[model samples]
Target: MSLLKIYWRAMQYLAVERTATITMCVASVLVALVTLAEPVLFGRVIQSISDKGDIFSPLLMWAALGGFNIMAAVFVARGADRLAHRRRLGVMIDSYERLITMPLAWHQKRGTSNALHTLIRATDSLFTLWLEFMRQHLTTVVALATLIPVAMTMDMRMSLVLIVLGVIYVMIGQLVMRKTKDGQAAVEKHHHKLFEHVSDTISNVSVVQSYNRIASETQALRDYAKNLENAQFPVLNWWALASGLNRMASTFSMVVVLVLGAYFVTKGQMRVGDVIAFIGFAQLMIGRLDQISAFINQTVTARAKLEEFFQMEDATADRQEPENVADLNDVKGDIVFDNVTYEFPNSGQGVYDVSFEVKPGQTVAIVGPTGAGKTTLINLLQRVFDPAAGRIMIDGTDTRTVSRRSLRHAIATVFQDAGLFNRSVEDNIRVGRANATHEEVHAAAKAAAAHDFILAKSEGYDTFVGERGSQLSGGERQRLAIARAILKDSPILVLDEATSALDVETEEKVTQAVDELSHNRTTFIIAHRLSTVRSADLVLFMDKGHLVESGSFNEL
Candidate 1:
């Protein structure tokens, strides 16, 4: 997007609190009017003092304008500051909600840390822009607009000098922005690389430690940081050059105005007080011009960050369900995939032309080797990826016709990763059903054979699980996931290698738990072990994205 469009888009966020925004805008104009009047009135006071008559009257007017300027600034500054903070937090939450709701494919393509960095940077930039608009930029614009016409009325020759200075400022800013635009974009890319790399390394720190690659990882991170600084320096240097040129032009403009004022004085066409007022105007114009230049610089950089944010927003828009789509209710767990097909982008490997059906309370075991699309098949049922051809149905209703949120609510999954938050054991279990009672959670944990180990912890059920449940054993993590799923009690249940982490003894007990949990639910088990497959009502054997065979366990 163009810089102006991005700026406008940022400003549009303030529409959520238009009343406060409009109030601040009006106050900005008032502040500008009063600010302009002060310098002119100061000139009047000077002339009056020089004439040795009626100095007190203009002095009073000057004092009044000064007080009004202070009051106006105070009101607008406080409101703008508070409003910016509130709106920044508000946008943060809105962006977070949009991001988490986005499809997993999008999150995978764009690293989570990159998305998080973009959101943080964009919201911070929005705060700066909003605060600057209300506290300074709007007032600068108004003051400049009023300064030009008013300066012309006093002395057109001096006003012309100020106008040239303004033009020079703009030219310098444009040149600098043009020089740094691509560089700033490169800097943002480097930032993403830095964040993504750190997040990846930290998430896999145990792997690094086990492999004794800590020094290597740290050195790699340092290299990324050095690259970021390398990209950033040139952009900073250009802005420095712009600043130098701007200061030179402004100083030259002031000198010319002074020289012109003296010439007019000698020619008997201007008063000493008017010359003073013209000098004030020149200073005010220069100050406002500098602010405009700084504002331009900020906008140029912010544009890149906001573009990423807007692009994410655009992606969400593309995937959003229709507004009137109905929620699924009373799902019967009957599911059908009618010749379904989905292919990965840029790769010829994905499930294709697969057809399947499960009765309301049947268990199907899908066994496949690595890269055999077993998880992809289950993902299809979970609607993680819509079938490129054909459709999925539940209870005779097309899955596509309902919202994904409602559809997911009827399903429970225990993924291979055993995804867990860095929260209390009880809290993690409660994720399946937020309001599940303490007794119910305990019962689910006992069923999953996790209650015994959980009670062995320092805080039992209240013990905190470190990031991704790092504080727990692999078997423990998987058991917690199973307990969470057991608590959910959804009509459709998917266990993706759910028992792979457990040892023989634990696996036997959990298998009994799983069997009990699968009693009346439509269950899909993706497993490689014959132990899990032997008990299924039907067995599906897949290879190379195609269902190769299906039968009772003995027949297979």
Candidate 2:
């Protein structure tokens, strides 16, 4: 989608509170009108001083105008700020919701850092754009629209001077901005790089410290900072030069207006007050011109950032779901892979022309050297990636015909790394069954042999596990994962070297738990250790995405 459409859609979050947004916009317009009225009123007061004797009433009127302007300005400023903040919160919340529901493959491709950065920065930039649009840019248009005609009516010569200066200011500003556009884009790129570097260092701090590479990493960060500075400095210099040149141009234009007005007044073509009013109008025009230049520069920078965010493609949840799902309460756990040929989108075959079948309650073990398709076979079974061709059937139904939720609900996996969240032990286990009761949680923990160590912790089930369960030992985390899968009670259990990282004692304990969990369920096990597959009813050996041998463990 186009950036304009994306930005417009993003703003729709404020539709719920459109009344507030409109009120704020009206307040902003009122503030601008009042502010502009002050200058016009002051010029009239000066004219009154030049003509009439008493200045008291005019002075009081001027003071009243000032007071009203200040009051309206406060309301507008506060209201705009409030609107921006509320809109930002709403956008961020919606973005988070969309991100969570996004597919797993989307997260894998985008990476955590890029996704987070886009969410935060895009919302912030949009808020800024909204505020600028309402509180400043809109007022600029209104003021310019009113001032030019009013100034022209007051004195044509002064109006002409103002218009000339306005054109010069725009031309110079545009030239400077064009020259610095590439530099600003480079600066934004380096800024994102710096952010990525910081995120990486903090996330992998342990590795950096353990490897004693802190100095090297710090130097790398310093280099990135230097690159950022290099990209930003030229852009800054250009803006500074633009500001200086604009001021000089404004001063010269003011002088020309004064000279021209004096000549016109002497020639009896313009009155003194008319000249003074035109001068005020010229000054207002110059101020607005400067503001426009600054706004353009800021918008350019914001657009660069916004375009980066808009480039991210939202993931499509286009997977075909089953129309009529069969009840799995009496499922026999039979799994079959029939003439499957799988290939990655950008690579050669991951698993090709493979065929396999496991009867209900059968224990199948897949053994292979590194680079073999053992893991790919498991992925295809789970439908993480659909096969390039052929079918995988569960309980006589093509897996592709069923909803992912339904298919996955019938199978449970214990990965080698044991992916665990940063939460309490009980909470982590409860992920397997979100609505599982406390008693059920304890039962699963006990079944996986994690209850004893968990209870020994200071807070027991409430003990906090750091990110990825980093606060726990490897064995403890693994056991907790097993408990989770056990609680799920799926008919098909997959163990991908599930106990590979554990010591012999811990491995035996976990294996015993797995054995109990696998009872009466079809189980698939992938293991490097030959001893691990001794109890399996069938063993299949694979190499290079193809099945090479299949037999009972003794026969293999």
Candidate 3:
């Protein structure tokens, strides 16, 4: 979709999320009409006094109208404030869900920090726009539109001044907007670089401290900021010029209208009171015009970020699972890969049309050198990405024929990195099954040989693991991951070098735990040393991008 569609989608959210908006808009219009009536009434009150007539009735009516306008504005503005906050939080939640669920490929280039900046800054822009829509933009538009008719009611000549002022400001705004757009886009790009640098630096603060590279990192950040200021200053200058020119035109237009009013007044073509009212209207119009000019500038700056955020929203899953697919039934462990092929988008390194199968409850070892698509194989099975041309069958059912959640839930994995959170060990293990009990977590940890080490910690299972399990040793983290998978108790378990970080004795103990869990379940093990998988029911050896050999460990 185009940017227009994305913007319209955002606008639709105003009413879709909050029914109070319609009331706010209707009330705002009433407020505008009253505000628009004040000068006209004021002029009538003055005319009554000038004629030396009883001005009490006109004065009283003006007082009542102005008083009511303030109340209407107050009532509408307070409600609209509620809508702005609610809508801001609602859109923030929507943005987070869309971004986090988006494909890894899209996020990898910019990193989470960049995504975070875009989300917060753009949503803040949206909130400002929304509040202005209720409090300023809509009111200004209504007043301007009412000014035309009300000004014409007294004199057509003065109405032309307001029209000319708007035309001049709008035309100039467009020209300046075009000139500054590309430069602002560059500014935004550099801002992301700064965001990414800070995020990466803080995440690896220990490394920076150990290496004593604080000064070097500070210098790198300064360059990013310097480049940004260089790109930003010119765009800012152009918008400043636009504002200055707009104000100048506003002043000139008012002076010209005053001149015309004076000439008419001398000729008895216009009344003195009418000229005063026109002057009041002219000043009001000037304020509104300046607001519009600033509003346009804000819109131009925010447009690019809004477009990028929605572009991610429109993006589909990295691997498209078919819609309306059959639901998976009671899963069995038979697995088959019939001539699967996959190619990396930016590299020449992926598996070719090679195939293999594992019988029910059998353990298969995948032995390969680095870059042999070992990890890639596991990703394909979970539909993180689909094979270019193949069907993976399990228990006489094609994996792609079922929902991704259904397929993934039947398998468990322990990665080279445990990928734990900053939460307690028990809570991290509970991720495998959200409702898993304390007893279940304890049992699973014991079965994976993680219980003893965990007990040594100050808080035991409740011990905060720190960020990404940083407080724990590598073996502890790895054991927690295995315990998590064991808690999941999936029928198929894949270990991608799950024990590579452990000492020899710890490795044996963990291996024994893994052996106990693997019985009657299908397993896939990828390891550098043959010891981990040499006794598997079958062995498949890979080289480059092909499955070069497969057999018993002895046959290999």
Candidate 4:
């Protein structure tokens, strides 16, 4: 979407804080009206002095207006500050919720670090936009709207000078921003690159340390920093020049107001008090012009950052789940893939036309060489990537027809990577069954032959696993994953090399745990190892994205 549309969407967030927003807007208008009124009242008080009429009452009234302005400032400033903070988090949380639901492939195609860093900055920019609007633009708008007509009524000739000055300001603003918008956008792109490179390096600190590549990584970061600076300095210079030029225009315009007012006075067309009021009007307009300049600056900066955020935006998420989807409960796990096919974009490789069906409680082992679509098939079964054409049915219901959450609820997955988090060992396992009791977690640990090693750790199950189970040996990580799946107790189980990292003895114990976990449920196992294949009720040999053979292990 373009900047205009994004800006419109941004203001829509005020809906969340409408009470504060409305109050602030009303107070801004009142303050602006009083500001306009103060000078007029002063002009009349001067007229009273000149004519030898009453002056005390008007002065008191002007003082009262000043007091009112102060009260409104307090309300507007405090309210908008708090409003910006609340809405800032509201934006972050909304973006976070939309992003986390996205499929993993999206993040892989778009770097997660780039996405997150841009989001954080965009959110900060948005907050500035909100507060700027509240603190300056609202009153600026109100003052400008009130100043022009009343000043024109007072003296159109004097007003025309300010109008022409405003026209000049507008012309310069458009020209400068038009010149620098592309350069600023380019700078932001490289800035995102620096952000992602740093994120990647930090995330892989272990590899950097192990390979002695700290100097190389630091040099790479410096190179990105240099590139970012090279691109940004020109744009900053142009903006500074625009600001300097605008300031010069402001000074000249004030002098023009003074000169014109005096020339009118010589011709008997103006009064001294009226000239003073017009001068006051010119000064207010100049201040308002600064606000206009800042508004455009904030808008321009936010536009670029907002584009980065909106580029990775979600296609509106499915609230379709609770309202429309059939909920899965007490599932019986029969699975069918009918004429399924999906091709990876730009890779020209993925599952081809493939069909299979498994009986409820049946066991099927999918055997294949590396990159032969074995992992693809399991991902499809769990609805990670849908088939390009064809349907996956679970118990006579198309998997696509159900919400992904419910579909996953019926299947417990043991991923090839043994994905773990930066939480305690017991907390990580608890992800499998969120409310699983301590005794149940321990029971599953024993079933998967992981209890002893878990105890051997300094803090047992309470020990932090570090990141991605990195602190543990590969075998121990695999065993903890197995224990997690065992604890889940879902009716459908998928084991993708659930034991590949385990030693021979641990593999034997884990295989027994797997058998117990798979009883009376549908199971799909993908393994290159023959020992696991022999235990399946059915074995399918696959190659080149197609199922090449299917039968009992001996027959295959």
Candidate 5:
């Protein structure tokens, strides 16, 4: 999408609040009119002093214009500031909502830091753009349009001189901006690298300190910072040169206008007041030219940041969602994998022609060495990624025909990583069912044999788990995860090495809890431990993404 369309959509958030925005805009235009009127009034006063010799009248008129301009400037400044703040905040909130609703795979490609950088930088640029558009730039346009005719009426020759200077000023400003574009882009890139390096170092401070690599990491960060400064300094220097050249050009234009006005006055072609008014117009044009340069610089920088933000917003899901979802509420828990073939997007093989079936409420186990595609098979059943070919069916309906929410609701998983959020024990367990009661949470915790230990903690179920439940020991965290799945009570449960992190005694305890949870449910267990597989009603051994043996553990 184009930037204007993005900007227009972003403005929709402010539409409901249009009353305030409209008031602000009106105030801004009034201020601009007052501001433009001051210069014209000053020029008229100068002309009166030269033509009519009216001393007190010119002084009084000048004073009134000055006072009005000050008040108008204050109103414009305040209103523009408020408007910029409102628009920036609105854009940020809308961007965050869009980002959160975006698919999970979208986040995987762009790291978290990159996403945040785009959001913050783009909102800031949008604020600046809004301010320029509403206050300064709009007024500049109005002044240019109105002043051209007034200047022409006063003296056509002087008006032509001003127009020529304005064009030259614009051309020079564009040249300066073009020269700095690549340097500015480099500076922004290196700045982000410096920030990322520092952030990563601080986050992994313990690892750096333990390995005695702090010095090395700090040196790398310093190098990035130096490169950032190198790129920025040249751009700043070029901008300073451009401003200096602009002022020089303004001075030359003033000299030419003064000399030319004197020559015309000597020939009886111009009044003294006309000469003074021409000089005043020349000064106003110089100021406007400077503003034009500032605007161009701001626009280029804002465009760069806006592009980065849009790129992040463009991230989307690869797979399409199913329409016409199959009902899974009354599913019998029978799962069958029929000639399923899956290939990872950039990989040669993920799982190939895999086929399996589990009877309703049957306890099945998959055993394989590392890289046997066991986990890949489980992921396909969960619809984390759809199969490249063939189909997976639950009960009698194709899994693809069922909505992801419904299919996942019918099945529960306990991953090897545990996937615990940073929350109170009770809240984490309650994630099993959005409407699960506190009593139900405690019951499930007790069933998983985690209740006694949890209650023994400093705050019991109210104790806060640090990020990812890092505060708990491996066995304790695993048990809590198991308790969560038990609370879910889905008809089909998949356990992927659920007790692998526990000690022998803890493993046995967790295995007992798993066995209880698996009762009357179609269970699929992927276990590396021989003892765990021995308890399965049916065992399948897999190799190279293919099932090699199938039967009971004894038969296999």
Candidate 6:
């Protein structure tokens, strides 16, 4: 995106607090008008005192304007600070929500660490941009706009010097921006790589320690940071160059203004007071010009990060809810997969041309080896990814015709890993049903054989599970997950290798819980355990994305 477009988009976010934003912006302008009056009034004081005529009036007016300027500056500063903080948090949460709702494939492709860190870094940049725009940029712009015409009225030659300084600043800034565009993008790319590496190593820290690769991984991270520094230094140098050139121009412009004003006074074409006032105008204009240059540099540097942020935001457009989409309601658990096919991009490996049907309460066991599309089949049913070729129907309603939120609400799932957050035991179980009562949660935990172990913890049901339920044993985590599913009480259940990681005793207890949970619900079990598959009412033996054979337990 162009710099103006990026800035405009960011400004739109401030509109949420429109009244406050407008108030602060108008105050900034008022402050600028007062600031421009300062130098001119100071010159009047010099001219009046030198003439020994009406010196008191200019001084009185200057004092009053000074008070107003201070008041306005303070208001703008405080208001801008608060508004930027509020809007930064608001955008952070909004972006976080959008990112989570995006398709799983999107996260898989971009990587979670990249997306999350991008959000953090982008929001910080936005805060800085917003704060600077309100507190400095707007006022500087207004001062510069009003300064040039007023200077022209004072003396055309002095105005020319100020104009040249402004042009120099602009040319240097634009040239630096053009030169550093590609380098800044490379810097952002390196940032993502660093984020991805940190996330990968941290997530698998146990593996790193088990294999004694800690020193090696640390070296790798340091090496990656060195490469990031390498990419970033060039971009920084370009901006530094712009700053240096602009500073030189600013100093030279002031000298030229002084020399020209002195010559005009010496020739009797202008008074000493006039020259002094012009010098004051030159100082004000030069300072504002430098501020403008700084604003441009900051905006250009932020553009690449904001571009990534906006691109991620735009990706959600594809997943937007359809207009007038119907809600999936009163589901009876009858499911039909008719000629369904979905191929992973570039790899050509996914479920293909598969069809199946289930009544309201059948146990359909999907038995297959790894890469046989067992999980993919269930994922399609859950609307994680829509079939590329055919349709899925639940109770004769095409799955795609209904809203995804309502469709997901009708099904429950249990995975082998028992995904849990670092929260209380009760809170983890409550994930299955947000509004579940305390009594109901306890009952569900008992049903999953998790109630006793939960009570054994120091805080009972209120105990923290640590990260990913690390405080709990493997069997305990699985049981809490089962308790969550039980609390959900959905009409359709999917068990994706739910018992595959358990020992014989734990598997027996989990399997018994699963069997009870599956009663009178349409259940799809993807398991490699023959014992778990022995009692399925229907079996699907799949191979390489195709259902090669299917029968009852004995017949198969």
Q: Give the true-structure RMSD of model 2.
A: 3.6
Q: Which stretches of candidate 1 lie over 4 Å from their true place?
A: 47-55, 218-231, 266-270, 318-324
Candidate 2 regions exceeding 4 Å error are 1-16, 48-56, 192-195, 267-271, 313-332, 345-349, 530-535, 552-554
TM-score of each: 0.94, 0.87, 0.93, 0.91, 0.84, 0.94
lDDT of 2 by residue, 68-131 (tens): 8778778878887887898788778866776776666677776687888787777788887788
Model 6 stretches with alpha carbons more than 4 Å out: 47-55, 266-270, 318-323
Task: lDDT winner between 3 and 5, please give it.
Answer: 3
lDDT tens digits by residue: candidate 1, 200-240: 99877778999988999999999999999998999989988
Ranking by TM-score: 6, 1, 3, 4, 2, 5
| Residue 376 in candidate 6, Cα distance off native in Å | 0.8
Best by lDDT: 1
lDDT of 5 by residue, 94-179 (tens): 78887876654467676556678778888877777777766776666666776788778866887888888888777776687666
Candidate 3 TM-score to native: 0.93
Model 6 Cα lDDT, one tens digit per residue, 1-556: 3987888899887799988988987898898889888877777677544545445567788778989988887888788998889899999999989888888888889855778778888999999988888887888888789878987886777778888877887778778877688887787778778878899999888899999889999999999999999988887888788778977887888789778877775478425666777777777766766776777767776787788899988876755366788888988888888899887889888887888888777789988788788878888889888789998988989988888889889899997568999989888888888996899999998887788666775867788878878887676787788779878989898888777556888777767777876787888888888787666888878888988877666663
Per-model clash counts, in order, read 0, 0, 0, 0, 0, 0
RMSD of each: 2.3, 3.6, 2.5, 2.9, 4.0, 2.2
lDDT of 6 at 208: 96
Worst 10 residues of 2 by lDDT: 313-322
Clashing pairs in 3: none
Candidate 6: pairs in clash: none
C-alpha positional error of residue 412 in candidate 2 after TM-score superposition, expressed in Å: 2.7
Query: 2 or 4, which is superior by lDDT?
Result: 4
Model 1: worst 10 consecutive residues (lDDT sum)? 47-56
**Candidate 2: residue 34 Cα off by (Å):** 1.9
lDDT of 6: 0.81
